[PDB]
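Dear Dr. L.,

I hope this message finds you well. Following up on our conversation about the binding site, I have prepared a predicted three-dimensional model of the protein together with magnesium ion. For your records, I am including the exact sequence and ligand specification that went into the calculation, followed by the structure tokens. Please feel free to forward this to your student if that is useful.
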Amino acid sequence: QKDAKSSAYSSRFQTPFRRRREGKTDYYQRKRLVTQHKAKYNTPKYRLVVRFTNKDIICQIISSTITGDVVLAAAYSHELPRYGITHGLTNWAAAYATGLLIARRTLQKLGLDETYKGVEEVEGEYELTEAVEDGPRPFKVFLDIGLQRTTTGARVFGALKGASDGGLYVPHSENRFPGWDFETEEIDPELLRSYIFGGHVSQYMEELADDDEERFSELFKGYLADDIDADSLEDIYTSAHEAIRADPAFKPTEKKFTKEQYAAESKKYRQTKLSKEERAARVAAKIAALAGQQ
Amino acid sequence: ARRPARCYRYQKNKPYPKSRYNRAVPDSKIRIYDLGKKKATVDEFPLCVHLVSNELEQLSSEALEAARICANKYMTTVSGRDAFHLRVRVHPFHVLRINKQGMRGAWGKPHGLAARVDIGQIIFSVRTKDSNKDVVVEGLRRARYKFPGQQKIILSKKWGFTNLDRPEYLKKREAGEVKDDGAFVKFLSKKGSLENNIREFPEYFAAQA
Amino acid sequence: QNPMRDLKIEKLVLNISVGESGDRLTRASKVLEQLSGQTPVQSKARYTVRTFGIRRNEKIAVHVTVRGPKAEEILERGLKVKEYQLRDRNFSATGNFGFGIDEHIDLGIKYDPSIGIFGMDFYVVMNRPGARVTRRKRCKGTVGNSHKTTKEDTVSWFKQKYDADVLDK
Amino acid sequence: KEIVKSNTSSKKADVPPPSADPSKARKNRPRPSG
Amino acid sequence: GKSHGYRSRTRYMFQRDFRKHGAVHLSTYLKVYKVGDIVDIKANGSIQKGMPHKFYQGKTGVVYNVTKSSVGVIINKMVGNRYLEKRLNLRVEHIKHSKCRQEFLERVKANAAKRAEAKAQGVAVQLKRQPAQPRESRIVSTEGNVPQTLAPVPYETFI
RNA sequence: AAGCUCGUAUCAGUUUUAUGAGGUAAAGCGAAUGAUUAGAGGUUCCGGGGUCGAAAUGACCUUGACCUAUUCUCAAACUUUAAAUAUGUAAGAAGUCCUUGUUACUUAAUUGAACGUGGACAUUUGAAUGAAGAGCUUUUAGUGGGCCAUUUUUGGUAAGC
RNA sequence: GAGAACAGAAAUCUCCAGUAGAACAAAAGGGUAAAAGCCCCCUUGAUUUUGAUUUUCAGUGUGAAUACAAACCAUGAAAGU
RNA sequence: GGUUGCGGCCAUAUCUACCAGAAAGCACCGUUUCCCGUCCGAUCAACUGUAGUUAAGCUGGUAAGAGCCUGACCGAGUAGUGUAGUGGGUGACCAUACGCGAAACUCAGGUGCUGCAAUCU
Ligand SMILES: NC[C@H]1O[C@H](O[C@H]2[C@H](O[C@@H]3O[C@H](CO)[C@@H](O)[C@H](N)[C@H]3O)[C@@H](O)[C@H](N)C[C@@H]2N)[C@H](N)[C@@H](O)[C@@H]1O
Ligand SMILES: [Mg+2]
Ligand SMILES: [Mg+2]
Ligand SMILES: [Mg+2]
Ligand SMILES: [Mg+2]
Ligand SMILES: [Mg+2]
Ligand SMILES: [Mg+2]
Ligand SMILES: [Mg+2]
Ligand SMILES: [Mg+2]
Ligand SMILES: [Mg+2]
Ligand SMILES: [Mg+2]
Ligand SMILES: [Mg+2]
Ligand SMILES: [Mg+2]
Ligand SMILES: [Mg+2]
Ligand SMILES: [Mg+2]
Ligand SMILES: [Mg+2]
Ligand SMILES: [Mg+2]
Ligand SMILES: [Mg+2]
Ligand SMILES: [Mg+2]
Ligand SMILES: [Mg+2]
Ligand SMILES: [Mg+2]
Ligand SMILES: [Mg+2]
Ligand SMILES: [Mg+2]
Ligand SMILES: [Mg+2]
Ligand SMILES: [Mg+2]
Ligand SMILES: [Mg+2]
Ligand SMILES: [Mg+2]
Ligand SMILES: [Mg+2]
Ligand SMILES: [Mg+2]
Ligand SMILES: [Mg+2]
Ligand SMILES: [Mg+2]
Ligand SMILES: [Mg+2]
Ligand SMILES: [Mg+2]
Ligand SMILES: [Mg+2]
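The resulting structure of the complex is given below.
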């Protein structure tokens, strides 16, 4: 294509890591996350993996091994209809909810859930969950942004607040939470609390329903069909925090068919590739039409 | 100046070519390495004779030039300016030094060049038609007297300047596996993309015979 | 095989390359502000050339980037100035294209003799839906061969709408 | 108020680029006549 | 004047291998090191801190300490007519576990288990390797293989 | 020189096995860097001169430059590959396995990390060879112009340099 | 490479390619691509205490360097550095 | 078996061209009140999952494809080398003895493997 990469160029090309090629994995960040103090020997560094697809939220607790990464427990936003959120799966309150579920789900299966209650109050105030005296120390987990920007008020820190208010120790600071004012040099907990329950989404339903009925009909069409009122948003999340902290345990999907049935179908749409002998036919055949006139 | 060539005859030193470290070296006294009909087609000149070195030594760039001229002259005058292709197979990339107070700090400034030659390495090469063997031989034979040490003149089973002792070449010639390049040829590959291989060697395929 | 992929403008960047610092620069800067309705951005001289009278790091020029409908409206005003006639060069082999006018008053913009008269470079870049595949941080990728705005493609799109002419060739 | 564009290049020397020199111009070039 | 620096003459020694450059893969950070381990010191030129001096490149020794990013290693260096004990502080990118011990440990397991299956059956042990013994008497046949006799070859020029 | 502690104890200018390090020799240049001969094809609206056509932004003509695919020849301060000889470590009782004590370190955690009690396994006591013993201390002479041979090798035309 | 008034070889604006052919004060060599390079924000770990270790080595000094311990700081969302 | 999040080894995974992709996922995609960032809501931020599409990304297949990987009595026991001689040769240098033993070349084969969790007619 006039760029025409020479045989010599290709030969002296060194490939980046696979995950660097596909551009998923930052290995400058991953070296610093995973690396364990070596006088602490086999003690794992536990990451809080938060990721955002377009339609879903991924929250994973992850440790590392030479043979592979190993996840302790996982929580997705698509589980949230079980606890009462049927909408806004990619919004902030969803992250806070998903962060709380993974906070609760893990330390439950860790036997640390009863101790280290978490907050349960939710005024949106900055605190770590600090260790019990004469008792186990809180489960420590470190925030893994991935390739996400660090911006003040980014959804990923909604996951952070959810998990820290969930009782896990996930050290952090205020300034990337909504409500932090540079000039004021402080966090206003009001606005932060608002975002935990979706105050920013609800005020939009009201100003939109008032100013534009049609545009409002389009974005919130699911809310009109579900008879969900604008200011009822706080009760959907408040009550979801109940059921989540009530039943953190992960229930898997009901799994129509089986892994075997899926496989006998899900890709037999795979193109099976040719044998060497079939290839000698294709060569000798492709001869014919060009041998052909010439 | 030009101290005798007895002094630099033997390879006593690590190769010391013109480099970023060594500059201010003189020009080679041999420039032209191809003479005769140099654009003649590979088929023109089947017969290949070599001037081969039987020693391990350094040849001066001055003596390359002297013997180059020496061969070319007897070739053109006898058999004609177009009857042969003379290619010097050796290049003077090695720098001699002269000291030119005391032995104090005696490192040399560059005195001239020479070409490092090995046992059996080829120095001169000529291709002609078979009818001209005698003449080329006497050309090289006349040019041996310009070189130090012993060099042998070898009739080479091979086609021209290529490779592939003449029977083997002839099989590819009436094949279609031979495409004439400038002064040289390219050989049909069974490796590269089948598309441009058929356009590159239309005579082989196709029609294939 | 032609569903989404329509064609559109990525951005239109208006560029007045002034050639000096001071009054003239901030003046011609005002023109792009008062035109783009955005606030413009200044470029620094990459190096000193004495024949041009410019010193390195001195601010030569100002440009501005426009996107969306507002760009599509400023482009129209430019094409009027050229009378909807561009030339077959004029067009990047990568699909982009542009032109230039003199004396900016030739589209809107009354006069203000104290503000003055300046030409500008019009350059507009074409892309399709999916151009954030190459612009996004995560999973950056390269647009396929199909897609991939070409010069043949966007010359035809330039004749199809705007009802205008290619030239020469 | 005053925005300035960032320059990604690494070269800090105040020197012409490699392409600058009087060679490669033309005779013609524009040949303005009247 | 003469030049002997700390990195003097390491041009090729500390070069990184052809087409293996840049970032250090994570396995080297996940290895775990215990006092008394045997390690292979090969410096990594992309990591300048915790770097062995060129002498110890290729040398193998025991780790006497374990710290945050590094291990102390013990090497015996000969200076004069005796060896002197050296203690090295090296970052975990310059270090690897010796595979030589690893064969030995695996043979002690194998040796212990051989001695057990022998003592359970009350039979002879012989756990010490013998070197290759000369060979044993064979009868090679001629069926299918008739000795194909060979001759030296005339001189020929191929040029 | 004087001994001292002990004694098959451990030792070794050696091999064997296992496992590391190395960038010399050679090799390479239609593989990177740098040099080097020759023709061929293609591009130049993005060079010098065209002997037609006043037109010159026009076909056609030479010679540059670049591109592609080839060809002759190179490297102490080049290189993908890469020996030989040299070289590091290991071949157990100071080992291995079971059980379960200690701690202010460390872990979310009775987890780990160290150092232990008690129990098990000595035939070949975990390659070869040798070993005429091994280990250890004090104290002090003389010397600190060297030279030669083989091979490696630097300066020099070279030298009994 | 291909494009855009003045605009030229060389001003400034796109897009496309681009394994580093750049830059990292300086000699050269190594090293580095979501950086070790370019730009920006915040800083003073160029700080405190005394030990151990590597290179030259007599295993003296010196210069330089490496990893901790004990403080007090920086920075970041944090692991970390 | 597909697909996704986090990975291990880091081209058998890359490069070029052309095809193909059911279901889920992923994406592209719609929006600008709010936090947030811009010359520019392109990037970065936030909202909806609604109005659209597999066009691209992505995944697989195709190529006497470029590169990369592997194997061989392919070259070659060649080049280079440790050891020996009161071996040859004016010398250059070479042959023999006991050992070690390459690279290019040629041919042939291959074109990611896999770990944790989730999910899919
Ligand atoms: N290019 C020609 C090469 O020929 C020899 O190699 C021969 C080789 O020489 C040996 O080289 C070794 C080097 O130390 C040693 O074993 C002996 N000195 C020697 O007898 C002979 O034992 C072989 N029989 C033949 C081989 N051509 C030379 N050794 C090389 O230096 C020479 O450059
Ligand atoms: Mg190129
Ligand atoms: Mg090629
Ligand atoms: Mg980061
Ligand atoms: Mg902080
Ligand atoms: Mg010499
Ligand atoms: Mg002679
Ligand atoms: Mg800059
Ligand atoms: Mg020196
Ligand atoms: Mg190496
Ligand atoms: Mg290696
Ligand atoms: Mg440092
Ligand atoms: Mg060599
Ligand atoms: Mg090679
Ligand atoms: Mg070649
Ligand atoms: Mg030509
Ligand atoms: Mg011409
Ligand atoms: Mg190899
Ligand atoms: Mg190989
Ligand atoms: Mg003395
Ligand atoms: Mg004296
Ligand atoms: Mg004498
Ligand atoms: Mg230009
Ligand atoms: Mg690009
Ligand atoms: Mg950075
Ligand atoms: Mg320091
Ligand atoms: Mg807005
Ligand atoms: Mg948008
Ligand atoms: Mg966004
Ligand atoms: Mg498709
Ligand atoms: Mg292939
Ligand atoms: Mg000898
Ligand atoms: Mg032999
Ligand atoms: Mg592939």
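In brief: The beta strands of chain A are 47-52, 57-64, 69-76, 142-144, 180-181, 186-187.

With kind regards,
A. P.
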